[PDB]
């Protein structure tokens, strides 16, 4: 457009164009323009000069962007080096900061005139206060509780000030500000808060100014987070909030979220005020909400100011009712509102928005719990506490059954090879909701199965003739039925099932058309799968359900085939015992027939389903404990895949070109992906299978990894994204998942190392090297740490052969930045963690020249920004220092040629604002290193005592990289590293407490670190190591 | 059409850019390359009532590459806050990202996302995510790799801005 890289920004003043930058950053800038616009502005911030900002506003340009930017420039100067400005300049700022505040905050027409700018100046002023408020400028508060009582244009702004000052000292002190200083600033406000609460109580009782009061109110919610209890309960504050503000539209939400905080405290002392608060408010809600009004429609169509209130109320009720179930039951004169509130938590308990229904549910689960802890028995005598709730419990029991959540969270995702598969998400929020409703409902069933069974069946009778019918409805119900599984006695369950599964069967007759008969059959299959106990007793019935599943296998109608395999593997697991042993009134065990007729059950199944089906049978083959038999059940098991396998092996053994046909390579990926499943079930006894195809399975993996490499070279790396090199890429990877898989569940390490490892040494590792970098499968590293973590000592001797093949070549890919080959990054250091933590004796049997390249690699690890890789490195370092402290021989040798350097690297990481994540590992290691200095090392790092050397070495190392640190805070810090060197919780805090000091030029001398306070805290810790 | 300034913030390595990239080109970035200052890419989904355009302001998470932190928030219609369900740290700092944000824009539709919900070993257990409650925010459980609740953060914002709680993404031309 206009601006080019040549931009003047030194020894000159071009104000009129600075605007064209921000108006080109927050505006016109479509890309190339703002990418620079931000850079040129970014590099103008650290360019040392505070005074430079004066002209930005003095010669203002109506660009609140530039002014806000100039404000950041000033805030920067204050947050970094306020201690090195001579007093003449401090006042030059102070007087000017507050000056440009009043001359714009008192201006009545400054309503829309930048609510942001007005706020910034406040933050800047609060920043000055943080740098110095109790020290110098002690009048401040008194100068507000006197200057605010002038105009309301001032009073309204001084409130958003103290709101922020409170947020910076109490809410957001930790981390942003030093430790002992926070305590100074904290009890500094708590010291003269009585003088400002007078003005608060004042503006609420009198002032008619709406915005002002709203501020006085909003900016008060923050105080409730720390202020002494007295200012609340021991005064007419709880009262003035309900009577005067709770009912009005605008102060509606503000006052509610204040009460919600007050009610969150323990009731044990001010039992009277909590009582009055409850009733006084519960009635005030009756004058704001008809106790009958449809809440869901008040939310379905209501402005933001309305919607939020409903949520906050949901909070207040969940807060009070849960934290005062005591004061509400005993006090008989309060049962009045206890039910009037329980009802409110019931009307709002039916809004569409989940985030509100999770607040209510949170309480219902609590209530159902407390009444269950009392007596976990059904309605037989009479329950004591349940009386008050029996009525509500039924309304809740309905709420659950009415709005149950889908239990099985399923999603179809495409992976790296383009192929699409179905995943069942694990601990998501959605699949967590079902677990909270299930629990809530399974409580209110053990309290009365009748009432629940009534709602259940009445919902069902209406799901047939009662035309309460709907696809979503039939689903929602069968989620509720398959929910309270095993919640009742096996007898009351027997009639409940045959009642339901027969009405749905008759319902499956009425409803015609493959479309509706599917959704019905599905919700029957699922109900069954959720009731294992039932299926085990009635074999004849079970023998049918499975057979009818072998029927749905052939139903080409969408969804059905998937449900058939899902609902099948569900049963195959929980009832694995019945398929293997002979059944009474049966020729032979069932599993047998299933294997003799497997070529007809998967006749027309999608490949993805054939796999799932096998995995299902795998579990059944597993339940058969006896070896002799289980071995034949596998040779028959993997009978079809081994025909195709031997077919391709044979077909290819003559002219090895077969492995270049898109079809026959896709099939090999389908066979392995099956073996991976069967193995993922059968377990160790699956070895007989793996060992059969093993040598062949590797001979092909090798033949493919070559054709990939060759394809990558001669044709480039863009062949790695084409159909064929995708299928081959899967066959390769799966072979690894089968191997890495089985070993995970193997139980004979020696036999594994003797028979299965050697082939890999040649066919997998030596090939992982020959491969051109952009073809090396990283899964090879993972599938290696897995067999090391497993084998351990039995592969210790083969480590040299492993590293010699996959170490230096993999490391020459990831040492040129912190980005490329991400998978190879993580997989590598996971492998290193394996060897180090198990086969440590393998690091000793290798030359100190190789080991140096290894310890040098671990440092490279925890210097990553990859939060996971950076952690893997720290994990090894700590486990390294521990394994070394076993053999004093190589131990002392290690402390010699490394200790100092390591302690230097682990420090380059700590003082970096990009590794604060895995900080807990820092403090953990730094502590172990400094505790090891008080005894461990028995030699000499250099000339000198020995500890004394480190206490200085570290100091003179910090003082150098951070010269702006006075030799006091550096001495004190290094001291603490020995004091709380055995208290990692505080140690961790003492480090962050240092990372705060290095961010500011604390000046040559000031004595604001409060030595005598941070010192009697380190001696208070050093004396606690006893 | 109509476009809004979406502000995407959150701790580093969280997955903020990997997310935008998946919406922008359907590509999944497997590597971590900390975005500097702020990269702004336009994201367009169309609804049943016409196409919407989100000029996303993907910001920097790492303190080092902050840039003009709160300066990017100015003139924003909506916002997003993101953390990593595998790093308890990324969550712990949500109140902070929130703070500086609501100080600039004191009233805007805000979404809260937890990325990497596809990773088996979830660290930030879902039953402990309750910051958005009292702050009147909305929350989802996205997964930039699997696409779990892929568009739900946007779909939700689409409504809160237009005023139509019936808005739907379709995949039209
Ligand atoms: N396994 C898994 N990894 C993910 C997922 N989403 C994101 N990631 C990882 O997260 C990283 C994303 O990096 P970035 O987009 O730069 O994250 P960021 O927080 O925006 O970085 P900055 O903006 O510089 O602070 C990638 O390396 C991904 O591997 C996910 O859904 N599953
Ligand atoms: Mg980014």
UniProtKB/Swiss-Prot annotation, chain A:
Provide the positions where the record notes the PTM Phosphoserine.
Answer: 430, 1007
Q: Where is this region: Necessary for interaction with Ran and nuclear export complex formation?
A: 318-430
Q: One GO molecular-function annotation for this sequence? A: protein domain specific binding
* Keywords annotated in UniProt: Acetylation, Cytoplasm, mRNA transport, Nucleus, Phosphoprotein, Protein transport, Repeat, RNA-binding, Transport
In-chain residues carrying the UniProt-annotated modification Phosphothreonine: 428
Q: Which residues are recorded as modified (Phosphotyrosine)?
A: 434
The organism's superkingdom is given as: Eukaryota
SMART domains tied to this protein: CRM1_C, IBN_N
Where located?
Cytoplasm; Nucleus, Nucleoplasm; Nucleus, Cajal body; Nucleus, Nucleolus
Main localisation, per the record? cytoplasm
Q: Which Pfam families match?
A: CRM1_C, CRM1_repeat, CRM1_repeat_2, CRM1_repeat_3, IBN_N, Xpo1
Domain Importin N-terminal span(s) in chain numbering:
37-103
- State the oligomer form and interacting partners: Found in a U snRNA export complex with PHAX/RNUXA, NCBP1/CBP80, NCBP2/CBP20, RAN, XPO1 and m7G-capped RNA. Component of a nuclear export receptor complex composed of KPNB1, RAN, SNUPN and XPO1. Found in a trimeric export complex with SNUPN, RAN and XPO1. Found in a nuclear export complex with RANBP3 and RAN. Found in a 60S ribosomal subunit export complex with NMD3, RAN, XPO1. Interacts with DDX3X, NMD3, NUP42, NUP88, NUP214, RANBP3 and TERT. Interacts with NEMF (via its N-terminus). Interacts with the monomeric form of BIRC5/survivin deacetylated at 'Lys-129'.
Q: Which family does it belong to?
A: Belongs to the exportin family.
The job of this chain, per UniProt, is described as: Mediates the nuclear export of cellular proteins (cargos) bearing a leucine-rich nuclear export signal (NES) and of RNAs. In the nucleus, in association with RANBP3, binds cooperatively to the NES on its target protein and to the GTPase Ran in its active GTP-bound form. Docking of this complex to the nuclear pore complex (NPC) is mediated through binding to nucleoporins. Upon transit of a nuclear export complex into the cytoplasm, disassembling of the complex and hydrolysis of Ran-GTP to Ran-GDP (induced by RANBP1 and RANGAP1, respectively) cause release of the cargo from the export receptor.
- Protein name in the entry: Exportin-1
Organism source for this protein?
Mus musculus
- Gene (name only): Xpo1
Swiss-Prot record, chain B:
* Effect caused by changing residue 127 to R: Loss of normal mitotic chromosome segregation and formation of sister chromatid bridges
Q: Which residues form the Small GTPase Ran-type domain?
A: 1-164
Q: Tell me where in or outside the cell this protein is found.
A: Nucleus; Nucleus envelope; Cytoplasm, Cytosol; Cytoplasm
Position(s) of the covalent cross-link Glycyl lysine isopeptide (Lys-Gly) (interchain with G-Cter in SUMO2)?
Answer: 64, 145
Q: Which organism is it from?
A: Homo sapiens
Name assigned to this protein: GTP-binding nuclear protein Ran
Tell me what PTMs the record reports for this protein: Acetylation by KAT5 at Lys-127 is increased during mitosis, impairs RANGRF binding and enhances RCC1 binding. Acetylation at Lys-30 enhances the association with nuclear export components. Deacetylation of Lys-30 by SIRT7 regulates the nuclear export of NF-kappa-B subunit RELA/p65.
| Disulphide bridges | none
Parent sequence residues shown: 8 to 180 of 216
Q: Which UniProt keywords apply?
A: Acetylation, Cell cycle, Cell division, Cytoplasm, GTP-binding, Host-virus interaction, Hydrolase, Isopeptide bond, Magnesium, Metal-binding, Mitosis, Nucleotide-binding, Nucleus, Phosphoprotein, Protein transport, Transport, Ubl conjugation
Q: Name one GO biological process term.
A: actin cytoskeleton organization
* Self-association state and partner proteins as the record states: Monomer. Interacts with RANGAP1, which promotes RAN-mediated GTP hydrolysis. Interacts with KPNB1. Interaction with KPNB1 inhibits RANGAP1-mediated stimulation of GTPase activity. Interacts with RCC1 which promotes the exchange of RAN-bound GDP by GTP. Interaction with KPNB1 inhibits RCC1-mediated exchange of RAN-bound GDP by GTP. Interacts (GTP-bound form) with TNPO1; the interaction is direct. Interacts (GTP-bound form) with TNPO3; the interaction is direct. Interacts with KPNB1 and with TNPO1; both inhibit RAN GTPase activity. (Microbial infection) In case of HIV-1 infection, found in a complex with HIV-1 Rev, RNAs containing a Rev response element (RRE) and XPO1.
An annotated GO cellular component of this protein is: midbody
Q: Which reaction does it catalyse?
A: GTP + H2O = GDP + phosphate + H(+)
> Where is this chain primarily localised?
nucleus
Query: In UniProt terms, what function does this protein have?
Result: GTPase involved in nucleocytoplasmic transport, participating both to the import and the export from the nucleus of proteins and RNAs. Switches between a cytoplasmic GDP- and a nuclear GTP-bound state by nucleotide exchange and GTP hydrolysis. Nuclear import receptors such as importin beta bind their substrates only in the absence of GTP-bound RAN and release them upon direct interaction with GTP-bound RAN, while export receptors behave in the opposite way.
Q: Could you give the cofactor binding note from the entry?
A: Mg(2+) interacts primarily with the phosphate groups of the bound guanine nucleotide.
Tissue-level expression reads: Expressed in a variety of tissues.
Residues that the record marks as modified (N6-acetyllysine) are: 30, 53, 64, 92, 127, 152
Q: Which residues form a coiled coil?
A: none
Which residues are listed for GTP binding in this entry?
A: 11-18, 29-35, 61, 115-118, 143-145
Where in the chain is the site Essential for GTP hydrolysis? 62
Q: What is its EC number?
A: 3.6.5.-
* Positions of crosslink type Glycyl lysine isopeptide (Lys-Gly) (interchain with G-Cter in ubiquitin): 64
Q: Which GO terms describe its molecular function?
A: cadherin binding; chromatin binding; dynein intermediate chain binding; G protein activity; GDP binding; GTP binding; GTPase activity; importin-alpha family protein binding
Q: What is the effect of changing residue 12 to V?
A: Blocks DNA replication
Carrying N6-succinyllysine, the residues are 152
Q: Which family does it belong to?
A: Belongs to the small GTPase superfamily. Ran family.
């Amino acid at each position: 457009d206009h601006a080019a890289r040549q931009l003047l920004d030194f020894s000159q003043k071009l104000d009129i164009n600075l605007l064209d930058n921000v108006v080109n950053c927050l505006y016109h800038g479509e890309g190339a323009q703002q990418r620079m616009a931000q850079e040129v502005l970014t590099h103008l911030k650290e360019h040392p000069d505070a005074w430079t900002r004066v002209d930005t506003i003095l010669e203002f340009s109506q660009n609140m962007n530039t002014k806000y930017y100039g404000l950041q420039i000033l805030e920067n100067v204050i947050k970094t080096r306020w201690k090195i400005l001579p007093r003449n300049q401090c006042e030059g700022i102070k007087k000017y900061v507050v000056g440009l505040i009043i001359k714009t905050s008192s201006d009545p027409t400054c309503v829309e005139k930048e609510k942001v700018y007005i706020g910034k100046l406040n933050m800047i002023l609060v920043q000055i206060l943080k740098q110095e408020w109790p020290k110098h400028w002690p009048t401040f508060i008194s100068d507000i509780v006197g200057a605010s009582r002038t105009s309301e244009s001032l009073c309204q702004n001084n409130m958003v000030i103290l709101k922020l000052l409170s947020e910076e000292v109490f809410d957001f002190s930790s981390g942003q500000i030093t430790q002992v200083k926070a305590k100074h600033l904290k009890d500094s406000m708590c010291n003269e808060f009585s003088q400002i609460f007078q003005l608060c109580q004042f503006v609420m009782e009198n002032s008619q100014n709406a915005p002002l009061v709203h501020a006085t109110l909003e900016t008060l919610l923050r105080f409730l987070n720390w202020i002494p209890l007295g200012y609340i309960f021991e005064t007419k504050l709880i009262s003035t909030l309900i009577y005067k503000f709770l009912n009005v539209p605008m102060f509606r939400n503000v006052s509610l979220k204040c009460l919600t905080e007050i009610a969150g405290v323990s009731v044990s002392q001010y039992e009277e005020q909590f009582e009055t608060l409850f009733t006084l408010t519960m009635m005030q809600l009756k004058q704001m909400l008809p106790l009958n009004t449809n809440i869901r429609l008040a939310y379905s169509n209501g402005k933001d100011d309305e919607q939020n209130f409903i949520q906050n109320l949901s909070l207040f009720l969940c807060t009070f009712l849960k934290e005062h179930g005591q004061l509400l039951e005993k006090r008989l004169n309060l049962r009045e509102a206890l039910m009037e509130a329980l009802h409110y938590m019931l009307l709002v308990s039916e809004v569409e928005e989940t985030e509100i229904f999770k607040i209510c549910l949170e309480y219902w689960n609590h209530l159902a719990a407390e009444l269950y802890r009392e007596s976990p028995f059904s309605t037989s005598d009479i329950p004591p506490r349940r009386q008050l709730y029996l009525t509500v419990l039924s309304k809740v029991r309905l709420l659950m059954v009415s709005r149950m959540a889908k239990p099985e969270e399923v999603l179809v995702v495409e992976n790296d090879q383009g192929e699409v598969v179905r995943e069942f998400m694990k601990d998501t929020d959605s699949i967590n909701l079902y677990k909270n409703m299930r629990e809530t409902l399974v409580y209110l069933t053990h309290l009365d199965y009748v009432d629940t069974e009534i709602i259940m069946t009445k919902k069902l009778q209406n799901q047939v003739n009662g035309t309460e019918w709907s696809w979503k409805n039939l689903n929602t119900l069968c989620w509720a039925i398959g929910s309270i599984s095993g919640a009742m006695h096996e007898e009351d369950e027997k009639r409940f099932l045959v009642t339901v599964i027969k009405d749905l069967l008759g319902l499956c007759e009425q409803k015609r058309g493959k479309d509706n008969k599917a959704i019905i059959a599905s919700n029957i299959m699922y109900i069954v799968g959720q009731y294992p106990r039932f299926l085990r007793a009635h074999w004849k019935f079970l023998k049918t359900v499975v057979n009818k599943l072998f029927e749905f296998m052939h139903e080409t109608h969408d969804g059905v085939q998937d449900m058939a395999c899902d609902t099948f593997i569900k049963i195959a697991q929980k009832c694995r015992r019945h398929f293997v042993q002979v059944q009474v009134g049966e020729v032979m065990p069932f599993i047998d027939e299933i294997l003799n007729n497997i070529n007809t059950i998967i006749c027309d199944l999608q490949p993805q389903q054939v796999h799932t089906f096998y995995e299902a049978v795998g579990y059944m083959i597993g339940a058969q404990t006896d070896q002799t038999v289980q071995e034949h059940l596998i040779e028959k098991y993997m009978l079809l895949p081994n025909q195709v396998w031997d077919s391709i092996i044979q077909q290819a053994t003559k002219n090895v070109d077969i492995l270049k046909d898109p079809e026959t390579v896709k099939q090999l990926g389908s066979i392995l992906k099956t073996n991976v499943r069967a193995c993922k079930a059968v377990g160790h006894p699956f070895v007989i299978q793996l060992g059969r195809i093993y040598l062949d399975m590797l001979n092909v993996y090798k033949c493919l990894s070559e054709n990939i490499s060759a394809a990558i070279q001669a044709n480039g790396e863009m062949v790695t994204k084409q159909p064929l090199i995708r299928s081959m890429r899967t066959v390769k990877r799966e072979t690894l998942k089968l191997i890495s898989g089985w070993v995970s569940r193997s139980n004979d390490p020696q036999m594994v190392a003797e028979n299965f490892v050697p082939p890999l040494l040649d066919a997998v590792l030596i090939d992982y090297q020959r491969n051109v970098p952009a073809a090396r499968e990283p899964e090879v590293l993972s599938t290696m740490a897995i067999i090391v973590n497993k084998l351990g000592g039995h592969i210790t001797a083969e480590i040299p052969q492993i590293f010699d093949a996959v170490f230096e070549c993999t490391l020459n890919m990831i040492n040129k930045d912190f980005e490329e080959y991400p998978e190879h990054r993580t997989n590598f250091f996971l492998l290193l963690q394996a060897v180090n933590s198990h086969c440590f004796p393998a690091f000793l049997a290798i030359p100190p020249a190789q080991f140096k390249l290894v310890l040098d690699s671990i440092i490279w690890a925890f210097k990553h920004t990859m939060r996971n890789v950076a952690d893997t490195g720290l994990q090894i370092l700590f486990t390294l220092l521990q394994n070394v402290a076993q053999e004093e021989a190589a131990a002392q040798s290690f402390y010699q040629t490394y200790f100092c350097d390591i302690l230097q690297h682990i420090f380059s990481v700590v003082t970096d604002t990009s590794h604060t994540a895995g900080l807990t590992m820092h403090a953990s290691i730094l502590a172990y290193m400094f505790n090891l200095v008080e005894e461990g090392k028995i030699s000499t790092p250099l000339n000198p005592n020995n500890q004394m050397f480190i206490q200085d070495y570290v100091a003179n190392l910090l003082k150098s990289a951070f010269p702006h640190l006075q030799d006091a805070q550096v001495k004190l810090f290094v001291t603490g590293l020995f004091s709380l060197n055995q208290d990692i919780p505080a140690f961790k805090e003492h480090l962050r407490d240092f990372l705060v000091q290095i961010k500011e030029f604390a000046g040559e001398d000031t004595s604001d670190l409060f030595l005598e306070e941070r010192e009697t805290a380190l001696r208070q810790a050093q004396e606690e190591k006893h | 059409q109509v476009q809004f300034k979406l502000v995407l913030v959150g701790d580093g390595g969280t997955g903020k850019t990997t997310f935008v990239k998946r919406h922008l080109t359907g590509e999944f970035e497997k590597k971590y390359v900390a975005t500097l200052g702020v990269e702004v890419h336009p994201l367009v989904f169309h609804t049943n009532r016409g196409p919407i355009k989100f000029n996303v302001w993907d910001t920097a998470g790492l303190e080092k590459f902050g840039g003009l932190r709160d300066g990017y928030y100015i003139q924003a219609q909506c916002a997003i806050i993101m953390f990593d369900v595998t790093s308890r740290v990324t969550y712990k700092n949500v109140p902070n990202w929130h703070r500086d944000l609501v100080r600039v824009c004191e009233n805007i539709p805000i979404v809260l996302c937890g990325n990497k919900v596809d990773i088996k070993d979830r660290k930030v257990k879902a039953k402990s995510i309750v910051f958005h409650r009292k702050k009147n925010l909305q929350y989802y459980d996205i997964s930039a790799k699997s696409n779990y609740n892929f568009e739900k953060p946007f779909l939700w914002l689409a409504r809160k801005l237009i005023g139509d709680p019936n808005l739907e993404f379709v995949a039209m031309p």
